[PDB]
Design a binder for these strands. Structure first.
Lengths: 171, 190, 291, 130, 106, 199
RNA sequence: CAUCGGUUUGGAGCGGCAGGAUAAUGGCGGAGGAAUGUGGCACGGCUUCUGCUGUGUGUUAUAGCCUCUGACGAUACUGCCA
RNA sequence: CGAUGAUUUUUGCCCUGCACAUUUUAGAUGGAUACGAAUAAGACUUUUUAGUCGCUGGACCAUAGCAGGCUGGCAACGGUGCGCUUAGCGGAAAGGCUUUGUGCGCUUGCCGGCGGAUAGCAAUGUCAACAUGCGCGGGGAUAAAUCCUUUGCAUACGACUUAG
């Protein structure tokens, strides 16, 4: 989707036995706060004896990128369901925002594994600080010194249906 | 994976002048000139110096990268064809019936005429490609020498001669008769 | 269900439709391919079927049981008086096929060929080719201009020739006029050859030699409306079949719910255009020879 | 010699001046992917953009380090005087002439026609004798 | 003086329609040189004339007109919806109309 | 975007179906279209694949009478015409008129050899196909299935290009002379004012 | 044609206000650090050292970058304007 | 779909210069404005090293004058329309593209004088190419086919091959 990173905090409803239950935080990549709070309860019931009916959302906050114009490399740890089983995988993405790497991930597993949004768990998104942290060659090839490349065969978009001159692709 | 860039380096010997313009390679050497069109491939060329040429593929996938070292090898074969030549030697293999091979000329064209192959009355004729020289070896009994500047033409004439002498309706493990390429080298020994 | 037993189809689907020829004069569908290195020569001739005869001949075919031995063979006589050249046509290569560019005629045409252009000759003023005959007035530059156009643009040159049917015993007075392609030499050579032969006779001995293999173009014998039994050679039905037996019993399955084009049906038999090839020339006789 | 004809492409490199929206200049400061770059300029917002949305110009801002911040890019842009180099090219001149033509009024178009008539008279007079 | 045109060239393209049902009360018009809804919004409210020839003369003239006006844009490529006093006959699909420069708001 | 009296399209290097759809919408909307050089059109996919497709097309014929069935035209212009006609409601009077607005040719016959041929960028093979893909030339596909006049068209196309080259050399020479005359009248009062107006 | 009333679709619309990490950035200042190490230095292959260049070293020099942070100043986004 | 022959002695037919009036239009309303080829390439200059052009036709040509009137001058010896006229090229469906001389106009290249109203505040406010007919004028040419009789290379009848 078009996503945002949210900080969602929730807890079990206080009881006279437990008047200050533990506060649990999750980082959720969701298009809006309605899905952000929905995804939160989805993962807490995978981890704790809690429900939306027996729990309480305490805080929902957008987490903005720290340096949105600094180019980073992200490692994303995934747990997705295929047609046959459940698999763990790790992939890497280059982007300037943490959210935009997760958006690329969702497009990428849709394209390479036919994995829908419902079939994916994001275990962890980590910015790889060191160039030695980069394991995948499809993003390591852009970390070489003095990187240059042309864009051969440029196709120019025309406003008109008919053109009176021969087409060209220089660039 | 779309490799960002892949490179190969041609090496040009001292007397050879490669010449590339719009993926049309013209290699000139002491032995003559050879030309090759590579318009079916998306490659670019950079002259590093008079002894090296860079061959590059930009943002190429696995197969388009695979087509790069073959471009290098084809141009290298052109280079070694105009400076050393190519020589394929064929040996005549027969158990009973001697194979009578002659270099004949009919209608102004050179032909290799194979007779008596496995005793057959049929006369096999193989057209000799342009730029390719056939010779019956004097130093060796039952040997044909296929030589020329173009490796592709030389090897294809050798293959024509070998393929026209195939055995039919027999156990070819037993009936091993034929004309086979025994040595693939160069005219100028190194 | 399949046929109980197999049998080949009756008749050829390559000679459909079995209709009457559009004309009685057989037309050369294809001429011999032109070779420039050869001399300029005609590729066809028109004659009249006289009759059949018998010859005796010594066979020269080694390995045959009739080798060096006399054979008795059927032969056909074709009456072929010399044809007269009266015109020339130029053809142009186009992306839609050959196209005739210009037709140049001779100055004088005989009456037998001018009757070709009439349905009622006896009631006519016989005005054909009179203004064209006037085109030759004292310089004939119109004719030379058309001939130059043919030389400049034509790739295929055909001559126009007619038979001298008055030399045959036929009571018909119309000559038969046909286009005969000229092969050999350049286009200019062909046009010069055609012009120099205007109003001249061309004999068979200048077109065909003895021992040649030639083709025959003709319209076959007409038989009128014919039933399937003789038109297509189908099997006669049993003697005890109701409503007759010279039929095809099943003219189709239930589906396709139509009669197919491949089923034998009654219709017109004979009078078809045929091209028959590889007829050997045993004799090119001469009319002046008394033997 | 060898005489190899080489491509005269424009490269995606740190220091390339690009047009954005066919109006404004920017420079590439760092490459993200085959498809995306980070661009910056004095009169544009530092942003991650796709190379399809921009056009590489024949101008390179020399000696621009990878990942340079806005202050460094602005200082080096002013030093190299990229704006003047752009404004001196036929590309920028054609863009400017297109804008100027688009701002003409009906009266100015009439004057253009009249002056064109005069210049055509002079041009034909010169052409017939040469 | 070789040109005297004061209207923009147009074409009667279609009726308003779904896949199978057409609505003759709305015509789809292509204004020449217009390729976007932003360009086509200049022409909203302008009067359209379909000029045609007829067998009978009316007051010495064989030229008749059906008048209309541009009401709204259509789609993304600069076609407009038009509303004529009498519906344009279906035979005019592909026929040229005149997009008038009035009511002017320049 | 202008309405033209006739749009003459040079069909060389154009993808068959994309050009067909664009031309179909053009002629439906009342525009006269001429497509020349239909033997230089392109279909995506290797030659063998498109030849197999045409043989699938040839398989189809009316069983009870072959003369009623589909008529498989072999000429490149007729292949383009079939592609276009499949995109037209050709069984109505309006579709029939729209098809009357169209002409397709092999080569560039008169009078179009001395007219302006345009291209259609949305249907150009060099601009549409990924640079590694294989394509077919309709002229080669037509010859492989029965078209007889390939060598006639190329002989006539070489003659036309020789004549068209003489045209261009003459036109280029007069452009050079006119440019030299416009250079002489530069920096004149009329020229300076026209430069301030953008001309 | 004008103006009105009802309904409705728009504009590259314009302005004011509020919220958020009282946006995150960026710019300016301070402190620390590293490399896809700038200058320099030491060895080299081609250069009359003509973006010459490669490999080492180390930490701003004849480029810069990253992290933390201090006082300001904006913008995005989402709402509100009777 | 092409080439070619002949096309009514009738007041009928053909070609052509006008003049007028009509029917029709799948839809004029300044101009269909002509290299070829590649596209991981094109084109300029030096030098084959390098620099420059494109990044769309929002271009080019044409465009002022009662739908464009009537007159005058200046500057140039150009531009353009029409009519004769010279020569050449074009056969893919050429039916078009050039070109010589000449004559009559116009010229907005520049500067003048006179005219337009009232169609009333819009009403397509009527201006085109193709065709046909009809009047004149100038030239030009002067047929066949079918039925019928006949034939039998044909044939159910039509049709076909012949002859008259």
């Amino acid at each position: 989707s078009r996503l945002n990173e949210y900080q969602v905090i929730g807890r079990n409803l206080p009881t006279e036995s437990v008047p200050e239950p533990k506060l649990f935080r999750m980082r959720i990549f969701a298009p809006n706060t309605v899905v952000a709070k929905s995804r939160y309860w989805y993962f807490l019931q995978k981890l704790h004896k809690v429900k939306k009916a027996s729990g309480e959302i305490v805080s929902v906050n957008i987490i903005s990128e720290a340096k949105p114009t600094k180019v980073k490399t992200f490692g994303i740890w995934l747990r997705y369901e295929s047609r046959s089983g459940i698999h763990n995988m790790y992939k890497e993405y280059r982007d300037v925002t943490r959210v935009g790497a997760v958006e690329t991930m969702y497009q990428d597993l849709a394209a390479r594994h036919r994995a829908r949004f419902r079939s994916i768990h994001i275990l962890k998104v980590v910015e790889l600080e060191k160039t030695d942290d980069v394991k995948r060659q499809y993003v390591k090839q852009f970390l070489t010194k003095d990187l240059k490349f042309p864009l051969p065969h440029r196709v120019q978009k025309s406003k008109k249906l008919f053109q009176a001159t021969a087409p060209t692709t220089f660039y | 994976m779309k490799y960002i860039q892949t490179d190969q380096i041609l090496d040009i010997p001292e007397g050879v002048t490669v010449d590339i313009k719009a993926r049309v390679v013209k290699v000139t050497g002491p032995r003559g000139e050879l030309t090759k069109d590579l318009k079916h491939i998306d490659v670019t060329f950079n002259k590093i110096n008079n002894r090296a040429i860079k061959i590059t593929v930009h943002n190429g996938d696995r197969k388009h990268v695979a087509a790069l070292r073959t471009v290098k090898s084809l141009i290298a074969n052109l280079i070694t064809g105009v400076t050393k030549g190519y020589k394929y030697k064929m040996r005549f293999v027969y158990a009973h019936f001697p194979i009578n091979v002659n270099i004949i000329k009919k209608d102004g064209q050179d032909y290799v005429e194979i007779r008596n192959f496995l005793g057959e009355k049929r006369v096999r004729e193989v057209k000799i490609h342009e730029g390719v020289t056939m010779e019956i070896s004097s130093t060796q009994k039952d040997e044909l020498i296929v030589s020329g500047n173009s490796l592709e033409a030389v090897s294809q004439n050798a293959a024509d001669i070998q393929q026209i002498c195939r055995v039919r309706n027999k156990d070819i493990r037993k009936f091993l008769d034929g004309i086979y390429v025994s040595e693939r080298g160069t005219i100028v020994e190194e | 269900s399949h046929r109980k037993y197999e049998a080949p189809r009756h008749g050829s689907l390559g000679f459909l439709p079995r209709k009457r020829a559009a004309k009685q004069r057989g037309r050369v569908k294809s001429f011999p391919k032109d070779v420039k290195s050869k001399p300029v020569a005609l590729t066809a001739f028109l004659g009249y079927k006289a009759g059949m005869t018998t010859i005796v001949r010594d066979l020269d075919r080694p390995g045959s049981k009739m080798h060096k031995r006399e054979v008795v063979e059927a032969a056909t006589v074709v009456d072929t008086p010399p044809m007269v050249v009266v015109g020339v046509v130029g053809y142009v290569e186009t992306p839609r096929g050959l196209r005739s560019l210009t037709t140049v005629w001779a100055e004088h045409l005989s009456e037998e060929v001018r009757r070709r252009f009439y349905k009622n000759w006896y009631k006519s003023k016989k005005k054909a080719f009179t203004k064209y005959s006037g085109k030759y007035a004292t310089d004939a530059k119109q004719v030379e201009t058309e001939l130059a156009r043919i030389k400049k643009y034509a790739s295929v040159v055909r001559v126009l020739a007619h038979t001298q049917i008055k030399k045959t015993p036929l009571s018909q007075k119309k000559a038969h006029l046909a286009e005969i392609q000229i092969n050999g030499g350049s286009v200019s050579d062909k046009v010069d050859w055609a012009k120099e032969h205007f109003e001249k006779e061309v004999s068979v001995d200048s077109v065909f030699e003895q021992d040649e293999m030639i083709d025959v173009i003709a319209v076959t014998k007409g038989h009128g409306f014919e039933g399937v039994t003789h038109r297509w050679g189908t099997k006669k039905l049993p003697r005890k079949t109701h409503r007759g037996l010279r039929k095809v019993a099943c003219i189709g399955a239930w589906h396709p719910a139509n009669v197919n084009w491949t089923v034998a049906r009654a219709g017109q038999n004979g009078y078809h255009h045929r091209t028959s090839i590889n007829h050997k020339v045993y004799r090119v006789g001469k009319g002046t020879d008394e033997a | 010699s060898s005489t190899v004809k080489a491509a005269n492409w424009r490269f995606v490199e740190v220091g390339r001046v690009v047009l954005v929206d066919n109006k404004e200049l920017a420079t590439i400061v760092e490459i993200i992917d085959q498809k995306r770059v980070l661009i910056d300029g004095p009169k544009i917002q530092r942003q991650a953009i796709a190379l399809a949305k921009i056009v590489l110009t024949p101008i390179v801002l020399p000696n621009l380090p990878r990942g340079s911040r806005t202050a460094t890019v602005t200082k080096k842009w002013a030093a190299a005087d990229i704006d003047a180099k752009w404004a001196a090219s036929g590309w920028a001149k054609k863009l400017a002439n297109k804008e100027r033509r688009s701002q003409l009024s009906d009266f100015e178009r009439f004057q253009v026609m009249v002056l064109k008539k005069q210049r055509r008279f002079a041009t034909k007079k010169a052409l017939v004798k040469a | 003086a070789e040109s005297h045109r004061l209207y923009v060239k147009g074409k009667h393209i279609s009726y308003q329609r779904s896949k199978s049902v057409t609505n003759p009360n709305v015509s789809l018009i292509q204004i020449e040189g217009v390729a976007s809804p932003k360009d086509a919004k200049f022409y909203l409210g302008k009067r359209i004339a379909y000029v045609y020839r007829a067998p009978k003369e009316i007051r010495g003239s064989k030229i008749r007109v059906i008048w209309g006006k541009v009401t709204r844009t259509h789609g993304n490529n600069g076609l407009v919806r038009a509303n004529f006093k009498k519906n344009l006959p279906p035979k005019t699909f592909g026929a040229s109309v005149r997009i008038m420069l009035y009511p002017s708001n320049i | 975007s202008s309405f033209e009296k006739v749009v003459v399209i040079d069909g060389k290097g154009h993808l068959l179906g994309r050009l067909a759809s664009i031309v179909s919408k053009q002629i439906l909307n009342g525009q006269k279209v001429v497509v020349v050089r239909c033997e230089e059109l392109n279909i995506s996919g290797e030659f063998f694949r498109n030849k197999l497709k045409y043989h699938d097309y040839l398989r189809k014929a009316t069983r009870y009478n072959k003369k009623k069935g589909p008529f498989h035209f072999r000429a490149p212009s007729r292949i383009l015409y079939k592609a276009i006609r499949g995109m037209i409601p050709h069984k109505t009077a309006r579709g029939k008129a729209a098809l009357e607005r169209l002409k397709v040719f092999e080569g560039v016959p008169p009078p179009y050899d001395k007219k302006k041929r345009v291209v259609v960028p949305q249907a150009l093979r060099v601009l549409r196909l990924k640079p590694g893909r294989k394509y077919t030339t309709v002229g080669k596909l037509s010859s492989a299935v029965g078209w007889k006049y390939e060598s006639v068209v190329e002989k006539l196309e070489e003659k036309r290009k020789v004549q068209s080259a003489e045209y261009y050399a003459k036109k280029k020479a007069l452009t050079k002379k006119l440019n030299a005359a416009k250079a002489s009248t530069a920096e004149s009062e009329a020229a300076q004012k026209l430069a301030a107006f953008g001309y």
